[PDB]
Design a protein around this ligand. Structure first.
Ligand SMILES: CC(=O)N1CC2(CCC2)c2c(F)cccc21
Ligand SMILES: *[C@@H]1O[C@H](CO)[C@@H](O)[C@H](O)[C@H]1NC(C)=O
Length: 360
C-alpha cells in the first residue's frame, strides 16, 4: 500500500480548495523514484466543472480520499507484477485539478475553482526532497491519459526545478502513457457549441484560459501567445523537450476515437469508417517514427502502465516492462542486442496484434 500525505503547503489545492497530496511507499536503499500522474479527462468552464464536481468529485477534491491506495502495474512492489521497477520508491499523485496538469490558478473571488496541476507536481517534488528524494539518482515522472499528457507538459519543469534547487545529479525522465493525441479530422464533425460537441483543440484552447494553463517554455516560444494549445499535442511538444521521454500509446486509443466521434458497436464497419480507422493508426505510427523510446501496440484500448496485467502485451515479442528495462540500459553512462526500445506495431487494424488486451 501507498500512504496518503496531504501537501504541507495548503495553498496548493485541488479544484475546490481542499489540499492536494500524494500517496507514497518508500523503498529504503533504492535511489529510483517513480512519480505517477493520474488521469481522468478535464473540465473547461463553470458548467462542465460543476457537473464534474457532482459525479466525479474525487477528481476535484481530496475531502473523500482514502488514507491508502494499492500500487498496481508499474506502481506494484511485487516483481511478479512489476518486472521493471518493483523496488523503486513509489508515488501516486491523484489528479484533482481537472486541467491536464497544466494549471497555475488559485480559487479566489474571481475563480470558483483552483486549477493548480502544474503547481501540485512542483510542490510534491519539493516536499519529497525532505523524504528521501534528495538522494535519488533517477526520477521517472510517469502518467496515464491526462496524466500522460501531464508528463509531456511537466517533465522539463521538474528537471529545471531540481537543477535550481541544487540537485543536478538527479536524472529526470518521462513516461507518457496514453497521452499522445492527434488534432486530426473527426469522423463526424460537430461545431463547438457545448461540452460534448467541442473538439479537443477548442476545448483545450478554452481550458488554458480558464485554468491559466502553462506549457513548456520552448514549445511556448515556438507557438506563442494564443497558440499554446498546440503544446498539449504530443507530436508537437515532444521535439521541444530535453528530458528523455518514453512514449506508450495504443495506435487505436479509445479516448482518441471518442474525441473523433467514432463509436464501435457490433455491426460491420463500412468502407468510410474502415479507412478512417486505418488512417488513424497510420498517422499515429507516423508521429512515432522519430521517437526512439516508444511502445505502440495495434490495439483498441486505453491506458497500460498501472493495470495489473500490463506485462501481457508485446510488440514484436517484447513486453513493455522489458522495453522500459532496455530504455534504462540505453541511458547508462548504440542499440542493444535483443533489448529494443522502439516498438511500434505496423499492422493496420485493432487486435491484429494477438497480445492486445481482451477487454474481459
Ligand atoms: C482524447 C484527446 O484528444 N485529449 C486531448 C488532450 C489535450 C491534449 C491531450 C486530452 C487530455 F489532456 C486528457 C484526456 C483526453 C485528451
Ligand atoms: C506554497 O505554494 C505557493 C504556490 O506554488 C508558493 O508561492 C509558496 O511560496 C509556497 N509556500 C511555501 C511556504 O513554500
Amino acid at each position: 500500500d501507498l500512504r496518503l500525505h496531504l501537501l504541507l503547503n495548503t495553498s496548493v489545492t485541488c479544484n475546490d480548495g481542499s489540499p492536494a497530496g500524494y500517496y507514497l511507499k518508500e523503498s529504503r536503499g533504492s535511489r529510483r523514484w517513480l512519480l505517477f500522474l493520474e488521469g481522468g479527462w478535464y473540465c473547461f468552464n463553470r458548467e462542465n466543472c460543476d457537473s464534474r464536481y457532482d459525479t466525479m468529485r474525487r477528481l476535484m477534491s481530496s475531502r473523500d480520499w482514502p488514507r491508502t491506495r494499492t500500487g498496481t502495474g508499474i506502481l506494484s512492489s511485487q516483481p511478479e507484477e512489476n518486472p521493471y521497477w518493483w523496488n523503486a520508491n513509489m508515488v501516486f499523485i491523484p489528479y484533482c485539478s481537472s486541467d491536464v496538469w497544466s494549471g497555475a490558478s488559485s480559487k479566489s473571488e474571481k475563480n470558483e475553482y483552483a486549477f493548480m496541476g502544474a503547481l501540485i507536481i512542483q510542490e510534491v517534488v519539493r516536499e519529497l526532497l525532505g523524504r528521501g528524494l534528495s538522494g535519488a539518482k533517477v526520477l521517472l515522472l510517469a502518467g496515464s491519459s491526462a496524466g500522460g499528457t501531464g508528463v509531456l507538459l511537466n517533465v522539463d519543469r521538474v528537471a529545471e526545478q531540481l537543477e535550481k534547487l541544487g540537485y543536478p545529479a538527479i536524472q529526470v525522465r518521462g513516461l507518457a502513457d496514453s497521452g499522445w493525441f492527434l488534432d486530426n479530422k473527426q469522423y463526424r464533425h460537430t461545431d463547438c457549441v457545448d461540452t460534448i460537441t467541442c473538439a479537443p483543440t477548442e476545448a483545450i484552447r478554452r481550458g488554458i484560459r480558464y485554468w491559466n494553463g502553462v506549457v513548456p517554455e520552448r514549445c511556448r516560444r515556438q507557438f506563442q501567445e494564443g497558440e499554446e494549445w498546440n503544446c498539449f499535442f504530443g507530436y508537437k511538444v515532444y521535439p521541444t523537450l530535453r528530458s528523455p521521454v518514453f512514449v506508450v500509446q495504443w495506435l487505436f486509443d479509445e479516448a482518441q476515437l471518442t474525441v473523433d466521434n467514432v463509436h464501435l458497436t457490433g455491426q460491420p464497419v463500412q468502407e468510410g469508417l474502415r479507412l478512417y480507422i486505418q488512417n488513424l493508426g497510420r498517422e499515429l505510427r507516423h508521429t512515432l517514427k522519430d521517437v526512439p523510446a516508444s511502445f505502440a501496440p495495434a490495439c483498441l484500448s486505453h491506458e497500460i502502465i498501472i493495470r495489473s496485467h500490463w506485462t501481457d502485451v508485446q510488440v514484436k515479442g517484447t513486453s513493455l516492462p522489458r522495453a522500459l528495462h532496455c530504455w534504462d540500459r540505453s541511458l547508462h553512462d548504440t542499440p542493444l542486442k535483443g533489448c529494443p526500445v522502439h516498438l511500434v506495431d505496423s499492422c493496420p487494424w485493432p487486435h491484429c496484434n494477438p497480445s492486445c488486451p481482451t477487454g474481459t
